Design a protein around this ligand. Sequence first.
Ligand SMILES: *[C@@H]1O[C@H](CO)[C@@H](O[C@@H]2O[C@H](CO)[C@@H](O[C@@H]3O[C@H](CO[C@H]4O[C@H](CO)[C@@H](O)[C@H](O)[C@@H]4O)[C@@H](O)[C@H](O)[C@@H]3O)[C@H](O)[C@H]2NC(C)=O)[C@H](O)[C@H]1NC(C)=O
Ligand SMILES: *[C@@H]1O[C@H](CO)[C@@H](O[C@@H]2O[C@H](CO)[C@@H](O[C@@H]3O[C@H](CO[C@H]4O[C@H](CO)[C@@H](O)[C@H](O)[C@@H]4O)[C@@H](O)[C@H](O)[C@@H]3O)[C@H](O)[C@H]2NC(C)=O)[C@H](O)[C@H]1NC(C)=O
Ligand SMILES: *[C@@H]1O[C@H](CO)[C@@H](O[C@@H]2O[C@H](CO)[C@@H](O[C@@H]3O[C@H](CO)[C@@H](O)[C@H](O)[C@@H]3O)[C@H](O)[C@H]2NC(C)=O)[C@H](O)[C@H]1NC(C)=O
Ligand SMILES: *[C@@H]1O[C@H](CO)[C@@H](O[C@@H]2O[C@H](CO)[C@@H](O[C@@H]3O[C@H](CO)[C@@H](O)[C@H](O)[C@@H]3O)[C@H](O)[C@H]2NC(C)=O)[C@H](O)[C@H]1NC(C)=O
Ligand SMILES: *[C@@H]1O[C@H](CO)[C@@H](O[C@@H]2O[C@H](CO)[C@@H](O[C@@H]3O[C@H](CO)[C@@H](O)[C@H](O)[C@@H]3O)[C@H](O)[C@H]2NC(C)=O)[C@H](O)[C@H]1NC(C)=O
Ligand SMILES: *[C@@H]1O[C@H](CO)[C@@H](O[C@@H]2O[C@H](CO)[C@@H](O[C@@H]3O[C@H](CO)[C@@H](O)[C@H](O)[C@@H]3O)[C@H](O)[C@H]2NC(C)=O)[C@H](O)[C@H]1NC(C)=O
Ligand SMILES: *[C@@H]1O[C@H](CO)[C@@H](O[C@@H]2O[C@H](CO)[C@@H](O)[C@H](O)[C@H]2NC(C)=O)[C@H](O)[C@H]1NC(C)=O
Ligand SMILES: *[C@@H]1O[C@H](CO)[C@@H](O[C@@H]2O[C@H](CO)[C@@H](O)[C@H](O)[C@H]2NC(C)=O)[C@H](O)[C@H]1NC(C)=O
Ligand SMILES: *[C@@H]1O[C@H](CO)[C@@H](O[C@@H]2O[C@H](CO)[C@@H](O)[C@H](O)[C@H]2NC(C)=O)[C@H](O)[C@H]1NC(C)=O
Ligand SMILES: *[C@@H]1O[C@H](CO)[C@@H](O[C@@H]2O[C@H](CO)[C@@H](O)[C@H](O)[C@H]2NC(C)=O)[C@H](O)[C@H]1NC(C)=O
Ligand SMILES: *[C@@H]1O[C@H](CO)[C@@H](O[C@@H]2O[C@H](CO)[C@@H](O)[C@H](O)[C@H]2NC(C)=O)[C@H](O)[C@H]1NC(C)=O
Ligand SMILES: *[C@@H]1O[C@H](CO)[C@@H](O[C@@H]2O[C@H](CO)[C@@H](O)[C@H](O)[C@H]2NC(C)=O)[C@H](O)[C@H]1NC(C)=O
Ligand SMILES: *[C@@H]1O[C@H](CO)[C@@H](O[C@@H]2O[C@H](CO)[C@@H](O)[C@H](O)[C@H]2NC(C)=O)[C@H](O)[C@H]1NC(C)=O
Ligand SMILES: *[C@@H]1O[C@H](CO)[C@@H](O[C@@H]2O[C@H](CO)[C@@H](O)[C@H](O)[C@H]2NC(C)=O)[C@H](O)[C@H]1NC(C)=O
Ligand SMILES: *[C@@H]1O[C@H](CO)[C@@H](O)[C@H](O)[C@H]1NC(C)=O
Ligand SMILES: *[C@@H]1O[C@H](CO)[C@@H](O)[C@H](O)[C@H]1NC(C)=O
Ligand SMILES: *[C@@H]1O[C@H](CO)[C@@H](O)[C@H](O)[C@H]1NC(C)=O
Lengths: 763, 763
Amino acid sequence: ARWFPKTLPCDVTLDVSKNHVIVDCTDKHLTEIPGGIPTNTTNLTLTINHIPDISPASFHRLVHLVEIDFRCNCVPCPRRLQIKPRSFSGLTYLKSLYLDGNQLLEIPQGLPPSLQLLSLEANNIFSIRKEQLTELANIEILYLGQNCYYRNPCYVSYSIEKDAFLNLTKLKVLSLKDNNVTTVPTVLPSTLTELYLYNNMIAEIQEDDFNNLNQLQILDLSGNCPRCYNAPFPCTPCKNNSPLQIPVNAFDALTELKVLRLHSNSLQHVPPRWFKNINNLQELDLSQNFLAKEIGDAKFLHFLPNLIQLDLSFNFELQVYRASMNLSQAFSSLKSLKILRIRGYVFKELKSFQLSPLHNLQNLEVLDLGTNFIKIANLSMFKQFKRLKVIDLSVNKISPSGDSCRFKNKEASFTSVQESCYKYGQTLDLSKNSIFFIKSSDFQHLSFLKCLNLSGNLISQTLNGSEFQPLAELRYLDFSNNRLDLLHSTAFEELRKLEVLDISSNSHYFQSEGITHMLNFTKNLKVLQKLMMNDNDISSSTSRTMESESLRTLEFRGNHLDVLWRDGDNRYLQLFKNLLKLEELDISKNSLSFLPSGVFDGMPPNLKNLSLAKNGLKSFIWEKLRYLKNLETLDLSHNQLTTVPERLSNCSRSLKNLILKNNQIRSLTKYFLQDAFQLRYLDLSSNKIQMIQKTSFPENVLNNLKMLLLHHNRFLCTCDAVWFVWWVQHTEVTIPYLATDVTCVGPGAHKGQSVISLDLYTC
Amino acid sequence: ARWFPKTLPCDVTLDVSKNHVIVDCTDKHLTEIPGGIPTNTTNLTLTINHIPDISPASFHRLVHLVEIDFRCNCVPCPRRLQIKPRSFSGLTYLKSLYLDGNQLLEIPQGLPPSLQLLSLEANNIFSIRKEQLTELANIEILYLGQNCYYRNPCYVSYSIEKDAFLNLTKLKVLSLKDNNVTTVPTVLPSTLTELYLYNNMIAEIQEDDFNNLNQLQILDLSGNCPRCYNAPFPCTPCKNNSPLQIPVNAFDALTELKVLRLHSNSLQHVPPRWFKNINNLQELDLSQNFLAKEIGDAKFLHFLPNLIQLDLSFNFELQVYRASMNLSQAFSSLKSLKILRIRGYVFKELKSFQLSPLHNLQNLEVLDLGTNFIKIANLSMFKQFKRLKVIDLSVNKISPSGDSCRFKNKEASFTSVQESCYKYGQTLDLSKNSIFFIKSSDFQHLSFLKCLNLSGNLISQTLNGSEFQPLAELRYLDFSNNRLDLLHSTAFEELRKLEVLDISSNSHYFQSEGITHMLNFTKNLKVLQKLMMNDNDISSSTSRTMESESLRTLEFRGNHLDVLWRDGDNRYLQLFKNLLKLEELDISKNSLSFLPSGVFDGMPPNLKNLSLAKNGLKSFIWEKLRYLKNLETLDLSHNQLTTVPERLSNCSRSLKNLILKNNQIRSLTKYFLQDAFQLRYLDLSSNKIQMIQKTSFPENVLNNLKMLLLHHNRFLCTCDAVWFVWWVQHTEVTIPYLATDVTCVGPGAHKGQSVISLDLYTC
Ligand SMILES: *[C@@H]1O[C@H](CO)[C@@H](O[C@@H]2O[C@H](CO)[C@@H](O[C@@H]3O[C@H](CO[C@H]4O[C@H](CO)[C@@H](O)[C@H](O)[C@@H]4O)[C@@H](O)[C@H](O)[C@@H]3O)[C@H](O)[C@H]2NC(C)=O)[C@H](O)[C@H]1NC(C)=O
Ligand SMILES: *[C@@H]1O[C@H](CO)[C@@H](O[C@@H]2O[C@H](CO)[C@@H](O[C@@H]3O[C@H](CO[C@H]4O[C@H](CO)[C@@H](O)[C@H](O)[C@@H]4O)[C@@H](O)[C@H](O)[C@@H]3O)[C@H](O)[C@H]2NC(C)=O)[C@H](O)[C@H]1NC(C)=O
Ligand SMILES: *[C@@H]1O[C@H](CO)[C@@H](O[C@@H]2O[C@H](CO)[C@@H](O[C@@H]3O[C@H](CO)[C@@H](O)[C@H](O)[C@@H]3O)[C@H](O)[C@H]2NC(C)=O)[C@H](O)[C@H]1NC(C)=O
Ligand SMILES: *[C@@H]1O[C@H](CO)[C@@H](O[C@@H]2O[C@H](CO)[C@@H](O[C@@H]3O[C@H](CO)[C@@H](O)[C@H](O)[C@@H]3O)[C@H](O)[C@H]2NC(C)=O)[C@H](O)[C@H]1NC(C)=O
Ligand SMILES: *[C@@H]1O[C@H](CO)[C@@H](O[C@@H]2O[C@H](CO)[C@@H](O[C@@H]3O[C@H](CO)[C@@H](O)[C@H](O)[C@@H]3O)[C@H](O)[C@H]2NC(C)=O)[C@H](O)[C@H]1NC(C)=O
Ligand SMILES: *[C@@H]1O[C@H](CO)[C@@H](O[C@@H]2O[C@H](CO)[C@@H](O[C@@H]3O[C@H](CO)[C@@H](O)[C@H](O)[C@@H]3O)[C@H](O)[C@H]2NC(C)=O)[C@H](O)[C@H]1NC(C)=O
Ligand SMILES: *[C@@H]1O[C@H](CO)[C@@H](O[C@@H]2O[C@H](CO)[C@@H](O)[C@H](O)[C@H]2NC(C)=O)[C@H](O)[C@H]1NC(C)=O
Ligand SMILES: *[C@@H]1O[C@H](CO)[C@@H](O[C@@H]2O[C@H](CO)[C@@H](O)[C@H](O)[C@H]2NC(C)=O)[C@H](O)[C@H]1NC(C)=O
Ligand SMILES: *[C@@H]1O[C@H](CO)[C@@H](O[C@@H]2O[C@H](CO)[C@@H](O)[C@H](O)[C@H]2NC(C)=O)[C@H](O)[C@H]1NC(C)=O
Ligand SMILES: *[C@@H]1O[C@H](CO)[C@@H](O[C@@H]2O[C@H](CO)[C@@H](O)[C@H](O)[C@H]2NC(C)=O)[C@H](O)[C@H]1NC(C)=O
Ligand SMILES: *[C@@H]1O[C@H](CO)[C@@H](O[C@@H]2O[C@H](CO)[C@@H](O)[C@H](O)[C@H]2NC(C)=O)[C@H](O)[C@H]1NC(C)=O
Ligand SMILES: *[C@@H]1O[C@H](CO)[C@@H](O[C@@H]2O[C@H](CO)[C@@H](O)[C@H](O)[C@H]2NC(C)=O)[C@H](O)[C@H]1NC(C)=O
Ligand SMILES: *[C@@H]1O[C@H](CO)[C@@H](O[C@@H]2O[C@H](CO)[C@@H](O)[C@H](O)[C@H]2NC(C)=O)[C@H](O)[C@H]1NC(C)=O
Ligand SMILES: *[C@@H]1O[C@H](CO)[C@@H](O[C@@H]2O[C@H](CO)[C@@H](O)[C@H](O)[C@H]2NC(C)=O)[C@H](O)[C@H]1NC(C)=O
Ligand SMILES: *[C@@H]1O[C@H](CO)[C@@H](O)[C@H](O)[C@H]1NC(C)=O
Ligand SMILES: *[C@@H]1O[C@H](CO)[C@@H](O)[C@H](O)[C@H]1NC(C)=O
Ligand SMILES: *[C@@H]1O[C@H](CO)[C@@H](O)[C@H](O)[C@H]1NC(C)=O
């Protein structure tokens, strides 16, 4: 509630339905908590700052607070944060509290009984006692990880007294990652659901370690006795490279377990007895181990019928280069398997019969096989994997056939990189491979491919319309980081159903001058929608115009359009005129010092998104914008403009997203925003503007403005801008960083003063 | 003769034995020829400048000139250079003349009969007539190339009248490269020795084309009907991709021919009848052709018993990936073959039996096989090639086994890149290959290897002293652009005879902090002499000191020595102290803002070459140089020093090569060079110095100075430096760019004035 604040430098978000008020003071360099904080707020953000300590009077009048965040307030900085006694007892409605990165020595006392979450990561608490945990009898989620490890050493092994967590009957999630823990803290409460003991120094597991945990769902034991070969981070292998000793009858009481992580445990064998009782396991991680021989046997896979995810990445043997992948026949028992990763299983040749166990997996979607240094791989063997969604053929050497400060979620699963080409259907990610030329015979029996990534292959070829013949249903093609010779206009002609084409980073042949550059090759593409050819350094073009009846988006950044539009050369003025359906243009970083007269007349009639960022436009004309009757998102950021148009209404009748970020403008015209009621977005940040007059900023136009930025510039706070001073502190226009970034240059003592906090009584 | 010049801005070189005087005015921006040119000069250099034309009075008093160079005086610039009539008749002793890059339309007339060389490259002369060549009856070398091609088009085919060169009885070398020539200009004089007709549009060769040439030694026919696939430069294939039609009885009259170039001719067959008469052929070029099938036959090789060089690079077929290299059995007839290049013959697997024809070549030294995309290659097959000097295993994908403005020489042969490792003996250049780990078994039967290049392989391995076991006699090892984990001090221990080690560009594992970095691994290397570990970004080291009893040179540039020598951290102060025999150090680009006191005491006793370039030394102490009793070549270029030492004699008693290039020094001490008789080299260029006093620059010290630089700085030419003005124009000290780079800041009209050309009579 309370809607209107007075001088708070933190953003306020109101949710009437949720009855939640959010205050975000992230990255504000506040030495002390600012005054005037509303009593109706629910979430308080007090992240990285210069707060010396915490006082009971800080939250004296705040009784509705339900979330306090104090993450990374002192990253190892002055002395450690000190908390006065009874500093949290007054928050009866408190439910969540974060104290990560505060260099605390012991667990704070006096916490309210209503607390449900407590985070104490990146601290110096290496001792756990029941006396300090007595007050936390109603806690549900506990985060005590990253207290003693290589980044934040403490030189003392973690000590937990007997039955420390036993009386925490409400505990559900416990994390002890990177805490130098040697022994699992028995006895954990029976209500635990997620346990995170990974990246510790645990060497053995007892048979009664998880005897009472029946509701556990997620168990993590990574980093115990890890595989330290070629590790880019400090680690200590266990002795004799011994594996993490886990008894056969260890996961017996676990019946609701769903996620089990054993990554980087130096395991050599996986007994089937482990998975005898856990019949509902969904995700299993076994990466960074020594299970190369176990993959050939994989006898334990017969006890996982409901498995969804299986990770076996980077299990290669030392000084061993396998001739082929030895997949066990027990892989056919993974009926519900969806994602499979066999990376780091480096081998020479991949054959069709080696993937036979995966032929009957109906629910399999993703097959990851990248980073395996595969030399010989017949692509026609994938004709049986039509139901697969993503097939990974990454940096391995396949060649053509011959003749705590952020992330409040804390413990979260690894989110897979959702590439832009996955949404189009079947994907064959052949990026960074050893393919140096394209044959139509190689891609035979692959008409089902809706996607094909070939970035980084460094292919030097002159396509004439026959290489991608079998790819009849291809919709997305990636050809970045290659050497494409556009000597013919018939390239990609046989890709009838292609929609998006990426030929970026092909600067090699485009840099050479005097050779033909057929830029009209998009005419044959009937259903092409997006074309990305940026960072190509295109300086000449044999074709006068580019023709396309369906292209809508075109990226032409990082090229040389100045030479194409050189003074006295009108050949390429109407280069984009024939693109009738084009709606977005991205001609940026083209070293365009100036725009010759006539280019705007040659722009497509349906242009709607024009960008000229980072170009260096010394003088950009504005009366020529009348030609563009559909322009809405003109962008001139990071340019060297110096003059605003006399009347924006006379320039464009539809511009609504004008941007002039990081420009050099010292003053605005007296009628800059006169009768411009169609404008919605305006940006003038990072400029050299001095003052704004009333006649240039009418309130009628400013009322409908969604967002306006005037931060990080050189406004002068003198008596000549009383109207501006009154308006900035009495309007509802959303101006970000109003009290943090925009300051006053002068005069004299007014250096660094906040405009919204200015009250010139003498004026 | 004449020894002493007056105001010439060109360097003068005297050779009394050769009676030659050389004047070099290269890159001087001279609008007109300066006055005071000696009459005794022999060679005149008048390269790229702003000379408008040539007048007869330019060489009026010069009668001893024997060489005039006028190369690239106007690169397509004002209008073309105009030569007045009878502008060269007065040079009776002229023998050589260069007029390249002058946009001349016709051959200049009135040349003296004593001329022997004439260069007219990069001009607009596309017509040749006997009338203009009548005056050149005594010429020997003619250069008329690059007159009409893609860089300098003329849109007209070259026209040569019948028997134009017939009467040039003294002609020996003729060049017509890039001249758009269609037909060979019959009839060439019988005294021709070198013919250069390459990069032309010749489509056919007549049987009488070379009927009279019996003394010809070098013949070039490259670029005629060229192979235009993947060409980074403009080219036009002949029609029907026809080959250059050469009759069988074409090289019949040629008996002294030694070099024949047929590179890029689209040849398909090489008849043996071509080489029937040329029994003394030494170098043969057949690259960029379609002789992939001909290599399997190679029937013509039986007629080349005296061949020395054979080039067959880049003859791969389009859309064809050969399974293996098909070398003909006729290769055994090349008894005298020394260098063989089979690059661009892309094939999958290389086997031992495929190199059988080369097993009996006693004189074979270099075997080039790079850029072939070889996948499988057993390195043990090279045990039979012990006599070979260089074996090329370049960017192909071999993996570990599984289970006119310059170049006055004009027409010169392609100089092979002499890598630094070739001088050590047998070389196995395995750079940029697909090797990702090292096994001792792979390098078996290779104990004869004196060199091994492994740069760019990106190998991630933790060597412990057993990988390079069979390489007992290895002396040079290159490991640049890799990922070396120095977790053990026993690395390279088994390389007993190693002398030079290069572990540069291994920044990956060295950038990580907290992992061990055993920098004392050089102790085991008993005979190590040079160690290059630059650009490694080394910021921490587990070993306190580096020990080596034989290391003499150490490159440690592009690292982080500031963190190692951080204030309050004296652990790594004596890092290089134990290097007893070290004589050269290259610690540069280390971001060293300042040198903490004590590092000089920890320097090796025998240090002689110290470099601190591009470091950013805000304040470098000088009294600590007394510790270094053997310093001679101290370098502080591209630094931010501001104060010179009070007395250089008191600082170092052996410094003789002090360098302060690109520094920021405004003034020198009044006793900077007092009693410093041991100094030989001094550099103060690109500084902010204002004036020099007499008491700081005694003549006794300056007499023995070999070289001194005071160019490109901010000297002020007022009346306060009369002594300096007198001394700079009356001393014999070699001061480069004395009248071209060093100018006067002021005062007033004295901007840009030459100090050596200053005469202040009013002072
Ligand atoms: C202001 O502070 C409030 C608390 O003081 C915040 O309310 C919290 O909001 C989160 C959601 O953002 C709730 O989390 C719930 O989690 C359960 C369990 O889901 C678990 O599993 C999923 C994966 O399937 C995982 O993503 C979750 O993180 C959990 O691990 C869900 O079923 C719920 O729908 C909900 O997501 C908290 O319970 C809730 N706390 C309280 C006390 O209600 C509020 O978000 C804060 N607002 C801002 C703007 O920061
Ligand atoms: C000043 O001008 C003088 C002429 O006006 C220059 O004298 C010339 O010097 C060059 C050497 O630099 C002489 O070239 C001769 O070439 C023959 C034939 O060798 C040929 O083959 C070799 C490869 O085996 C090749 O490298 C050569 O370039 C030749 O193509 C050699 O046998 C000789 O030893 C010598 O190298 C000229 O003959 C000579 N000209 C005259 C008229 O004597 C002088 O070099 C100029 N000085 C400077 C500093 O520029
Ligand atoms: C995780 O806990 C283990 C518990 O052992 C820590 O190992 C201990 O580390 C300290 C500090 O390096 C060792 O103290 C050392 O003692 C030697 C004398 O033996 C002394 O010369 C050193 O200066 C240092 O004080 C201690 O011995 C060692 N414990 C054992 C059993 O070896 C480990 O450091 C902890 N990890 C982190 C990141 O804090
Ligand atoms: C085809 O495959 C290539 C390589 O696998 C993909 O390129 C990679 O795309 C990812 C995601 O866009 C890039 O990651 C990003 O890197 C930047 C730094 O450049 C970082 O700031 C981002 O946060 C993100 O991590 C990755 O760099 C890029 N790799 C290269 C070599 O460009 C490409 O996206 C694939 N194409 C399709 C259509 O899936
Ligand atoms: C090397 O010599 C050949 C000799 O044929 C040159 O080819 C000629 O090039 C000119 C200029 O492009 C052509 O003139 C053209 O004529 C057409 C009408 O046919 C006109 O529309 C053009 O505007 C141009 O004026 C000429 O036809 C052509 N000769 C032949 C037989 O095709 C070639 O250009 C020369 N190469 C260089 C680098 O100068
Ligand atoms: C081992 O093989 C590698 C690659 O074949 C060699 O590196 C290459 O060395 C040459 C000659 O030093 C470099 O050429 C130079 O390039 C610079 C530009 O960086 C240019 O300014 C010079 O004029 C010269 O052309 C080449 O760049 C370099 N390549 C790489 C990737 O570094 C290496 O020298 C070999 N090692 C031994 C001991 O022979
Ligand atoms: C694939 O892996 C399986 C299981 O490790 C291998 O089968 C074993 O092979 C060894 C060596 O011959 C025998 O001693 C075992 O008795 C075999 N066990 C079983 C259950 O068959 C198999 O040889 C591997 N195949 C390949 C090609 O490496
Ligand atoms: C990859 O596999 C496919 C199919 O298994 C092979 O296609 C065969 O090609 C030959 C010659 O073109 C035909 O005679 C066969 O009938 C094809 N097989 C089928 C099932 O139709 C292809 O040759 C394989 N690739 C390589 C390099 O061997
Ligand atoms: C596209 O390029 C391919 C590759 O060169 C052409 O295929 C060749 O065509 C020529 C002329 O008909 C034949 O002599 C070759 O035998 C063909 N090679 C192969 C491997 O088939 C193809 O004709 C070109 N297409 C167009 C329209 O230019
Ligand atoms: C793209 O433009 C080029 C010209 O820049 C077109 O090439 C011309 O094609 C016609 C028709 O065959 C020929 O008569 C001309 O001689 C060609 N000119 C050149 C310079 O090659 C090409 O056809 C265009 N492609 C498309 C698909 O429109
Ligand atoms: C290596 O090259 C030789 C010469 O081109 C090949 O020998 C020819 O092979 C063809 C095809 O079988 C025959 O028609 C010719 O009669 C052969 N000529 C001779 C002189 O033998 C040979 O087959 C090639 N070998 C490989 C493995 O490609
Ligand atoms: C590369 O060639 C060498 C020699 O030709 C092979 O060395 C053989 O290795 C086997 C098993 O180690 C021995 O039984 C043979 O006696 C060796 N040959 C000789 C001549 O001694 C080596 O195996 C080859 N590499 C590969 C990958 O096959
Ligand atoms: C250097 O590293 C190699 C590779 O690990 C070591 O060779 C292994 O040594 C262990 C211990 O003796 C054996 O169990 C393995 O069988 C060996 N592997 C191979 C491929 O031989 C070697 O011992 C190490 N040497 C030193 C001095 O540490
Ligand atoms: C290089 O220096 C490291 C120390 O930085 C040496 O490692 C020590 O070796 C001794 C002898 O075995 C051990 O007692 C120490 O515990 C080791 N210290 C560490 C930190 O590992 C290493 O031996 C040195 N190598 C050489 C060749 O001198
Ligand atoms: C124009 O581009 C911006 C870029 O963020 C986008 O937000 C906007 O929706 C685009 N406008 C149209 C009409 O597509
Ligand atoms: C500017 O706008 C006014 C008012 O609509 C109009 O009268 C005038 O013609 C316009 N001028 C230009 C150059 O568009
Ligand atoms: C020191 O290095 C320079 C670098 O050019 C070299 O010329 C000089 O000979 C070296 N001095 C000694 C004594 O090796």
